[PDB]
Paper text:
To this end, cryo-EM was used to analyse CBSFL-CHis in the presence of SAM. Micrographs showed that CBS retains a filamentous architecture in the presence of SAM but with a significantly altered morphology, as shown by 2D classes. Through helical refinement, we generated a global map at 4.0 Å resolution which reveals a central helical stalk decorated with highly flexible lobes. The overall morphology of the resulting filament is drastically different in comparison to the basal state, as reflected by the 66% increase in twist (−178.6°) and 10% decrease in rise (46.9 Å) of the filament in the presence of SAM. In the context of the full-length enzyme elucidated here, the SAM-mediated conformational change creates a central filament stalk composed of repeating units of the SAM-bound RD dimer, arranged in an antiparallel “daisy-chain” like fashion due to the interactions of the loop 516–525 with the neighbouring subunit. The central filament stalk is decorated by highly flexible CDs, where the active site entrance loops are free to open and hence increase the accessibility for substrates. Comparing our basal and activated filaments, the SAM-mediated conformational change to the RD is highly agreeable with that observed in the crystal structures of CBSΔ516–525 dimers where there is a relative 18° rotation between the CBS-1 and CBS-2 motifs caused by SAM binding. In our activated filament maps, ligand density was present for SAM only at the S2 site. No apparent and interpretable density was found for SAM at the S1 site nor at the filament interfaces. Overall, our data suggests that CBS likely binds SAM in a 1:1 manner and that our observed filament structures only reveal S2 as a SAM binding site.
Cystathionine beta-synthase (CBS) is an essential metabolic enzyme across all domains of life for the production of glutathione, cysteine, and hydrogen sulfide. Human CBS adopts a unique multi-domain structure: an N-terminal haem binding domain (residues 38–74), a central PLP-dependent catalytic domain (CD, residues 75–382), and a C-terminal regulatory domain (RD, residues 411–551)5,11,12. The RD adopts the evolutionarily conserved Bateman module, consisting of two tandem CBS motifs (CBS-1 and CBS-2) and a surface-exposed loop (residues 516–525) extending from a CBS-2 motif. Here we show using cryo-electron microscopy that full-length human CBS in the basal and SAM-bound activated states polymerises as filaments mediated by a conserved regulatory domain loop.
Author numbering:
A (entry chain A), B (entry chain C), C (entry chain D), D (entry chain H), E (entry chain G), F (entry chain B), ...: 1 to 144
The structure:
């Protein structure tokens, strides 16, 4: 039944993200002390530009390309199956199987001095099935 | 009953915002062509830095401080009441009671090259009672 | 300079109004898709008998007096700052300065079988600020 | 140059119209004391249901169809080269070139309880070249 | 029955007539506030030499032949058909059913020491169907 | 250099594990609030009889066998490239890449009444990349 | 210098243990032929519940409480001083210097069907100074 | 019962003994691989001049007096509860009650060139209770 | 039955040997006072370098090889069928039977500074049938 | 030189003898603690009838012919070499060489009232090479 549900309901309390210049070893700590596993990589403007995960992180360091002291900009995960918040859990349940996570985007349309429109994409969160499992374990009392 | 409803459920399709350098005259067009009157004023990084409304802009143009060719950066509406998307309708409905509009924000905590957290507030969108009315009109069908 | 202009100069094209029996939400949907905010409440004869505005409507709905399914007549915003089309832009601009909207009316005198005179008032149009702001933006391309 | 100008500029302070039930002897009187030539005929709802002119009337009286005590509604004039106030003076000029009068109208879009649109034609006023001649001496001080 | 009624018995209001030198517009604005449409042009005494109307002026002015600032002499409408006061209402019907007005003349036969018979055809006035309609309305009161 | 390091040094403070009867949703909660990802499934005697990981378990919920209220015993996950505690980081670096984790085994040789030996495998912990990733940063101060 | 060292480096390959049910004499034989002196006593679940030593044996066997053919659980040594593997070598130093043998333990906490937690204590390896002396004579080759 | 028996019956294994100058670690390894707990210290002539024990040796390094590479004559133990082969098992068992081992000695009456009598003490071997317990483990099947 | 018995169970009386540097006359003296038939000859280190018997003396004195003042090392007897202290009494009795004396030796495996294994041999004692004949009367009360 | 010596100087103090009925072990014990090997067996008057040694007695006991409890008379060794005291030491020494003992007999030459001379040969004693060895050792002191 849960696949009926929608992305926004899932409580993406995930404001955390990184710059590409963050030291690899530091991110390793932050995720673990938080218990997290993957962190979004954006610019200081917040523009979505990549990902970082242990799976590529361990693979990269063990590949010998970088040190833990290196910056994540050079080991940036980018192949995320990113989804939109407006979508349903079925798509989430679909996508979140081949890998543990996927980005949810929020779109931002700015207009220039001359009224010319522009588009900015923002991070709504970084979700995993735990959020799905956590949410599905409780909310079924209300809108099942 | 609807005041219990959760804010993110309100179907905000509101990515449009403006740079402060946009000309007032063009600004009116974009809102009026959209049927809008108020729009977020943000930087190129999406920094929540003010507003623009009907009363803000009508008073400003009638006061003569901004010509129609003037930029909105001079008269950016600032006294907006603001809510968070994780909040509830009842307070937002309360919030909308004494204003024409309300701002919803979001947060995104970037982490430095040194791994230090840095919190950035990000625009979620712009809500007027139409959004509440439009959704509660839909909730007439969804309360099943 | 524009405030000296005649009210009729603006050209408030749309004469869109409602009867006091249409469902509250239905009014809201019609205005919102078109982006409107208000609608004159007149009889089938067209006699100006009131107004309805979202600021009243949001307050009315949140007051609990009307469901969205309720009729619009019971929340008739019959009070309005009303001006005549034969009047000056500045005073209407003055009128809109501290109001969410303004009303203009069209007079009409009928003579019965005995020729005794009568008076009727039709709606010339409904004006908000963005009428003027767009109009002065357009008109200053011709007369300025 | 004036023929290019908009209809509404011509100061059409002409709200007077009659019910069809008014007698012949009173219609002539009012138009005579007003110095008028013709008078619109509408219902109590303002529906544009006819006309009456000296040419229509004189032909009617001299044909014997209406006694002076008879109603103008029996011989209600209804033909006219009707125009709408959004148009230009040249078309008004064009229409008045061969008719003995010109008719201008106005619109009102009422909406029912079911949200169904209803465009209602409404009288704006009666115009003759006097309105042109009176006002042509005026705009040659404003736009000329 | 009224067709028998004597033209003299109608009781024209009065003659109003100007000299050809004065401009059209000044005559035009005067006649209209009296409600008039057509005005004679005579010599220093009242001899028939000219005739002006709105119908020909509007036709001529929009044709561009003369301006409203042009003298009233160039808008002459003397091609009228003319009647004598000794005739009856029926003759007016045979006149006014087509034209917009009728001319009635009169003789001011003053006698002097010049030694010859004198004849000076005066203008008796300007009569329209309103006079006819007023006269038949009045005669229906006399014949009561 | 780190592959020189030995498995024993890593310090897996990982005594936590589960029974097969543990509730599915409770299982995910337990790891999540603590921030873990997977915990061994053993009996009350500590026998290494299973494993629970989100990737199978998210698939397990999507397979429909388990609701969050279900037990993990019916979806007990039992494949793991388990490593031995005496090895080096080279094996860990090798083994721990193709999956996110691997069991580390302690062993126990119990002797019967007749002196017959009996080997019993024990869980020394549950390791992922962080354990070494944190450790490699630390071990550059002690052994290298 | 070695006293600083970590216990787990000491090659504590002592998975062997006994059930209480086995006779005393065989256990003494078992440790004798394999060369040990003392062996840990646990249940079939591997729960640490006792010990057996030469003094625990000879004194009891000379006390007459047990025949050599008597069961070993009768003389289960339990007054050992106990340490955890996570400690340092100097902690072993001030343990074996007065005790004739040393016990080390490993911990394991299991989580129930209801999610409640319970710890299990598991033997790591029965160690005496020879391991230390063997290890310290060996590890200095790694350092130097 | 066995305490009535005779020491010589026990059947010692062998006299594995060392010189004082032997390295501490080599004795440590030798007793390890042999499983032994101690070894007598004698000269090349076999004179009973010392002993080396686990408790002596563990205390020796941990007191810092000898490195593992140092020679054992520095810590030469001689406080053994020495016994003679001719003595009884019960006394030996009593003798082993507090010491972890008991030296068994042997005599040799060597005469000189002049016939002067002299006694040369000889090491018969080394015994722990494990000898006795194993010894009684079989003797109860033949001499009982 | 006694032939089944063992060296150690039979037991020695006492060991007495001498250096070869003793004179022949005193060798007779010590044996004759003891009634001994023979004597082992070793160094002060106890190495079994020879022995002396009655048959050695009778041949030696009557061959003129040694005077009583001469040393036995001149004619130190060397023939002897050496036996070990592990051997069945029947063999001992057999092995003694054809000879006139027999010797049992005791092993002594000592280790050097470099821990190199080395086995020296030690004299256990001299045995004649008296050792058998006296003890056989005793073990018939112990084994029988 | 000693071959000149005689039994009269020999000092054979060997008068002890046994009866044939005495038990072998009883004779064995007596001979052993005095330290002899061979024992004379004579009648109650001292007349020569028997002789025994250990060499045959052990051999006979090992042959199974007699037990140690058997009488000494059945284990006789009379196949000795017998000598007379009048014979020189050289012949004495010569004759004892190829054995372990020799017999010397007593032939006193006085008689009694029986009326006839005869011979009742008593044993003079039991000499060994040790006697000679003791004798030659002593006589070397006497002659020098
Ligand atoms: C505690 S971690 C558990 C580790 C597991 N491998 C995973 O990624 O889900 C999961 C929780 O952390 C939160 N989280 C994941 N990524 C995050 C991020 N980049 N910033 C802040 N929170 C995040 C999610 O809301 C999720 O509920
Ligand atoms: C249809 S307009 C009606 C006029 C109304 N007074 C207003 O502008 O907010 C309102 C709708 O547009 C959306 N909206 C308002 N401001 C917006 C903005 N700045 N960018 C994008 N959408 C916006 C809101 O969600 C609301 O549902
Ligand atoms: C496209 S709408 C823009 C959205 C905004 N709510 C509004 O109505 O102004 C612009 C025009 O709608 C007109 N308008 C507003 N209320 C009206 C009403 N009740 N009937 C007809 N026109 C109306 C305004 O005068 C304005 O010129
Ligand atoms: C003052 S009369 C004089 C001109 C001429 N008598 C005629 O009626 O055409 C004409 C003026 O009266 C006004 N008028 C004409 N008919 C009208 C009517 N039916 N109701 C109100 N005003 C009217 C027109 O604006 C026009 O400017
Ligand atoms: C409004 S006018 C009659 C309508 C006619 N179409 C006109 O406007 O001239 C009303 C009265 O004015 C009078 N009248 C018309 N023209 C006149 C003139 N030129 N001088 C004096 N009276 C005039 C007529 O007698 C008529 O009774
Ligand atoms: C904060 S969790 C992050 C998620 C990680 N993939 C995991 O294994 O759960 C990382 C730490 O949790 C610890 N851990 C993992 N499984 C555990 C378990 N079953 N019991 C106790 N600790 C565990 C590991 O030692 C690791 O250092
Ligand atoms: C080689 S034996 C030497 C004799 C020693 N005195 C002792 O305590 O047994 C000692 C070795 O056996 C190992 N050991 C001790 N107890 C053991 C047990 N119960 N099972 C398996 N190994 C054990 C220890 O780690 C130590 O390294
Ligand atoms: C075979 S080891 C068995 C291992 C056991 N941990 C121990 O040392 O007792 C035990 C045997 O070795 C013998 N032994 C002990 N120390 C000895 C030594 N220094 N030289 C020769 N044998 C020794 C003991 O007499 C005992 O019978
Ligand atoms: C007591 S004498 C018995 C009678 C006779 N003298 C003989 O030797 O057979 C023999 C005993 O002395 C002991 N013995 C023999 N030669 C010895 C020697 N060289 N040193 C010490 N004891 C010896 C033997 O153990 C034997 O039990
Ligand atoms: C000391 S024992 C040992 C010598 C010899 N191997 C033996 O066993 O007969 C020998 C001495 O005892 C003495 N002797 C031998 N037989 C004897 C006997 N039957 N009675 C008394 N003395 C005897 C001899 O004189 C000799 O000096």
């Amino acid at each position: 039944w849960w696949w009926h549900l929608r992305v926004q309901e899932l409580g993406l309390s995930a404001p955390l993200t990184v710059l590409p210049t963050i030291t690899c070893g530091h991110t390793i700590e932050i995720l673990r002390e938080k218990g997290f596993d993957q962190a979004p990589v954006v610019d200081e403007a917040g523009v979505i530009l990549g990902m970082v995960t242990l799976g590529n992180m361990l693979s990269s360091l063990l590949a010998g390309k970088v040190q833990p002291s290196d910056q994540v900009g050079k080991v940036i995960y980018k192949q995320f199956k990113q989804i939109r918040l407006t979508d349903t859990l079925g798509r989430l349940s679909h996508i979140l199987e081949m890998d543990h996570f996927a980005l949810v985007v929020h779109e931002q349309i700015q207009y220039h001095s001359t009224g010319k429109s522009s588009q900015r994409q923002m991070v709504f969160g970084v979700v995993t099935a735990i959020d799905l499992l956590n949410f599905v374990a409780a909310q079924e009392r209300d809108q099942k």
